[PDB]
Structure 1
Amino acid sequence: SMWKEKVQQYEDQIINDLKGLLAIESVRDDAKASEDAPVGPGPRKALDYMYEIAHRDGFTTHDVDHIAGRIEAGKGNDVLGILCHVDVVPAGDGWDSNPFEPVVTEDAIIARGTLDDKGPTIAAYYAIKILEDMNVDWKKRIHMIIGTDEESDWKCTDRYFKTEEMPTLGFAPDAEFPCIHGEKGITTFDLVQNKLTEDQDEPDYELITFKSGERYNMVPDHAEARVLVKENMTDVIQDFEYFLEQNHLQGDSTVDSGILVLTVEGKAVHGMDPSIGVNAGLYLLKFLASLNLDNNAQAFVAFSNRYLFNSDFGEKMGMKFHTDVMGDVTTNIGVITYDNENAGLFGINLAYPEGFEFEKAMDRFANEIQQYGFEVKLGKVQPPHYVDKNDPFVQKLVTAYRNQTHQKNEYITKKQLFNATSIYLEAIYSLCV
């Protein structure tokens, strides 16, 4: 395309830069490591080499303990990350050429690291340099993140991500769980009430059943309470209507034979953002809170009100947590049930960004709850993670690709190399410009 010519104007500089990087015997050497070169002198030089060309070309860089680092470009809130590495495996068995003296041929360039990774690392960097030469007007920051330690897999756990910013999206071809934003974390768990089989006076109201929602991460738009009314009913009915209008709610009340049936409609919406909908079940419990109920029903209504009502962002559970780009901890109450025999239950869906402290928070709350006769039953934990095929950059790469088109004696084709730059080039452009 136009992209392809563009690169062709940088052919010699790409080759030169590449040669320079292949010529470094950046092989792991644990026995000669130091604090200055934690995996040995080679990889350290290869990482330094990258910072030099970055500087030569005017990019800011940032080093992390001389094991990994980044070359920075672009402008804006979002950060696209491209993760690569400059360490290389040993050459070893029967090379027809010097593995760390690159030979550039007519069609091809021959050396260790041509394929993994030095070639793609250079392609990526040149896509960025080319775009920069255009003096193009960026809308995203780009972090070319460069590692040296084969032992790490780019986890939010590993040395770089302990302290450096997490890319909001990106490409990390060789890691299964890179620290890149992707999928919100998500769990479920039940809050279960301990039944209280004790003795008490007859109550103005006995809650017989309550049901709202189902076991989906949706905001329930329907709730029903069936209540035994000791004395008269005109007051409760009148108050329910008032409550419905004060809260701008559709709902309704039905009587038969001493049983009052209270019904509240809400607004279903996905549980991944509950603030947007209206939880019928929580609203109905909110109203029950004003009544003299039997003990168990009253503790159950009370619990909803202390921890649940009007707390879409985990606030009343001690779990508010805000992320600069990745969103907030979110709590949807998808299911609420109650009956005489089993007492009460609340099903919670809790969505979190990396890296909210999940189990620590649970434990704290798990205990706070003890005093109220409520326990936590843990559902499935699905931690935040990156999904390569959902990633908007990986996708532009596949599109850009479509638009265009440990061995011995490893080599890379000139054409493979320039094409790789064209495709990085197109994709990065479309996405950050």
Structure 2
Amino acid sequence: SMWKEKVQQYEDQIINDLKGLLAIESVRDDAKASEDAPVGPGPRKALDYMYEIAHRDGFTTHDVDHIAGRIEAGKGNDVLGILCHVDVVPAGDGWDSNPFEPVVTEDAIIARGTLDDKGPTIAAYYAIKILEDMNVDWKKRIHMIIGTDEESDWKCTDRYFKTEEMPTLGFAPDAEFPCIHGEKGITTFDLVQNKLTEDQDEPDYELITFKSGERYNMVPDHAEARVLVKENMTDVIQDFEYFLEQNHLQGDSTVDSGILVLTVEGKAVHGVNAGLYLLKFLASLNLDNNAQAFVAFSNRYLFNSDFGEKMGMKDVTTNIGVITYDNENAGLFGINLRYPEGFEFEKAMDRFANEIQQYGFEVKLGKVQPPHYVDKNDPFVQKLVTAYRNQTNQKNEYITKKQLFNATSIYLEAIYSLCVEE
């Protein structure tokens, strides 16, 4: 409530600006639109009005085709995004006032857009201003992004974000998928080998089975290969130990009646893939046709490509979490893939699936879930709810002076702690 009485000092100014904004009849008019006013004159003036008060108060602004724009504050690498709207739905008939003539009651402001979204826009705005008035030492930039087109849902695909920087965190009450960083996208898929049904001479080494990995999203910490050894057991055991030593790994081998069991420990999470290293050792040997192609595939595409590089998809992130092989079915890799907003996974998997068929392998992809914002997990959104709790216990549309100044003091708290650290 140091916040709350900090807002007390700006009361006149807040109501005055809100009045200015409310007096503009920023209702959509598609019939009157033009290049200068792509959703009508009304909304265009409301957007400009925000720019004017920003210029009046020393802030930089940036306009986008006269349909949306932003007010800029603060400094630092991260930008906090606060999205809102100054366009307004029409006045239903029979009000007990003129909807675009703000009436200032003893304790309330009555007009259209008092609730959505002009009250809150001004509230958000004055937060940034008041902090600017105190010469705070900003740690994050802020983009107060203002729209006029109710047909936008702020999608990464909608106009503003077609070209403008994504907020690294933020608040967007109305939007389902606003273009704001949050959760990385996710897919899983399998690389399945075509078993080559072809006779051959008896190899030095035959892979009977390979197993590594329980979950798509964990680094396998264990790998086991079982191998029928034709002649020389002693060299492969010696080389395996040297391999363990050179790559700083734990593992061992067991021999019984010509069956060699090779086992590698590795470290997990979601820290060394045991299966990939074990396949890397197997590539030095003369194996049967199918184990050889299977082992070679992992070396060409998978080994030491934590970040997609070898699949030419790289931060994008790939985990090889399942690895099987037997004589019968011929093995497969189960892949987990994470990616940030702005990676093209379609054309990527296209170039990959196509390029792989060369080696009798094919993609079978699982479900794909694209990158997206999660309000409830947004660091700002949480600080806002923390401050409500910390502070608080369309026809004839009105907003209370107390909701109005409550909102402001709440943005103030949350914004402060996230931008001037707290």
Asked if Structure 1 and Structure 2 have the same fold, meaning a TM-score greater than 0.5 normalized by the shorter chain, the answer is yes
Deviations 1:308-364 (A, max 9, x none): 0000000000100xxxxxxx0000000000001110100100000001001110000
Residues of 2 paired with 1:230 and 1:318: CA distance? Answer: 38
Q: What SS does the corresponding residue of 1:371 show, helix, strand or coil?
A: helix
CA contact (8 A) 2:215 2:321 kept: yes
Residues of 2 paired with 1:79 and 1:427: CA distance? Answer: 14
Tell me the CA shift for residue 406 of structure 1.
Answer: 26
Tell me the CA shift for residue 226 of structure 1.
Answer: 0.3
Residues of 2 paired with 1:92 and 1:428: CA distance? Answer: 36
Tell me the CA shift for residue 370 of structure 1.
Answer: 0.8
**Correspondence for 1:319:** 313
Tell me the CA shift for residue 269 of structure 1.
Answer: 1.5
**Correspondence for 2:160:** 160
| Matched positions, count | 420
Percent identity between matched residues is: 100
TM alignment of 1:42-57, pairs within 5 A: 42-57=42-57
Residues of 1 paired with 2:88 and 2:48: CA distance? Answer: 15
Residues of 2 paired with 1:354 and 1:112: CA distance? Answer: 36
CA contact (8 A) 1:184 1:353 kept: yes
Residues of 1 paired with 2:62 and 2:295: CA distance? Answer: 54
Query: Normalized against structure 1, the TM-score is what?
Result: 0.96
Deviations 1:176-206 (A, max 9, x none): 1101101011110000000111110000000
CA contact (8 A) 2:188 2:216 kept: no
Worse-superposed segment, 281-290 or 397-406: 397-406
Structure 1 runs of 4+ with >4 Å offset: none
Residues of 2 paired with 1:23 and 1:132: CA distance? Answer: 26
CA contact (8 A) 1:338 1:345 kept: yes
Deviations 1:85-140 (A, max 9, x none): 00000002210000011111100001000000000000000000000000000100
Residues of 2 paired with 1:39 and 1:385: CA distance? Answer: 28
Residues of 1 paired with 2:45 and 2:266: CA distance? Answer: 62
Q: What SS does the corresponding residue of 1:106 show, helix, strand or coil?
A: coil
Query: Normalized against structure 2, the TM-score is what?
Result: 0.99
Residues of 2 paired with 1:217 and 1:232: CA distance? Answer: 38
CA contact (8 A) 2:216 2:334 kept: no
Residues of 2 paired with 1:256 and 1:374: CA distance? Answer: 33
Residues of 1 paired with 2:241 and 2:393: CA distance? Answer: 74
CA contact (8 A) 1:89 1:406 kept: no
Tell me the CA shift for residue 216 of structure 1.
Answer: 3.5
Residues of 2 paired with 1:406 and 1:170: CA distance? Answer: 24
Residues of 1 paired with 2:262 and 2:59: CA distance? Answer: 65
Residues of 2 paired with 1:260 and 1:406: CA distance? Answer: 70
Residues of 1 paired with 2:118 and 2:4: CA distance? Answer: 20
Q: What SS does the corresponding residue of 1:84 show, helix, strand or coil?
A: strand
CA contact (8 A) 2:92 2:394 kept: no
RMSD between superposed Cα atoms in Å: 1.4
CA contact (8 A) 2:254 2:262 kept: yes
Residues of 1 paired with 2:251 and 2:193: CA distance? Answer: 27
Tell me the CA shift for residue 55 of structure 1.
Answer: 0.6
Deviations 1:27-81 (A, max 9, x none): 0000110011100000100000001101110011111111111000011010100
Tell me the CA shift for residue 382 of structure 1.
Answer: 1.1
Tell me the CA shift for residue 289 of structure 1.
Answer: 0.3
Residues of 2 paired with 1:83 and 1:406: CA distance? Answer: 26
CA contact (8 A) 2:26 2:43 kept: yes
CA contact (8 A) 2:320 2:336 kept: yes
Can you give the 5+ residue segments of structure 1 that lack an aligned partner in the other structure? 271-276, 321-327
Tell me the CA shift for residue 215 of structure 1.
Answer: 2.8
**Correspondence for 1:432:** 419
Tell me the CA shift for residue 253 of structure 1.
Answer: 0.6
Tell me the CA shift for residue 380 of structure 1.
Answer: 1.2
Deviations 1:255-279 (A, max 9, x none): 1111100000000012xxxxxx200
**Correspondence for 2:358:** 371
CA contact (8 A) 2:216 2:335 kept: no
Residues of 2 paired with 1:88 and 1:350: CA distance? Answer: 42
Residues of 2 paired with 1:36 and 1:338: CA distance? Answer: 64
Deviations 1:383-423 (A, max 9, x none): 11110000000000000111111910101000100000000
Can you give the 5+ residue segments of structure 2 that lack an aligned partner in the other structure? none
Residues of 2 paired with 1:292 and 1:181: CA distance? Answer: 49
TM alignment of 1:103-118, pairs within 5 A: 103-118=103-118
CA contact (8 A) 2:216 2:319 kept: no
CA contact (8 A) 2:30 2:39 kept: yes
Q: What SS does the corresponding residue of 2:331 show, helix, strand or coil?
A: strand
Q: Does 1:310 align with 2:301?
A: no
Residues of 1 paired with 2:393 and 2:40: CA distance? Answer: 19
Residues of 2 paired with 1:257 and 1:408: CA distance? Answer: 88
Q: What SS does the corresponding residue of 1:365 show, helix, strand or coil?
A: helix
**Correspondence for 1:381:** 368
Residues of 2 paired with 1:75 and 1:142: CA distance? Answer: 8
Residues of 1 paired with 2:49 and 2:331: CA distance? Answer: 64
Tell me the CA shift for residue 217 of structure 1.
Answer: 0.3
Q: What SS does the corresponding residue of 2:212 show, helix, strand or coil?
A: strand
Residues of 1 paired with 2:228 and 2:117: CA distance? Answer: 72
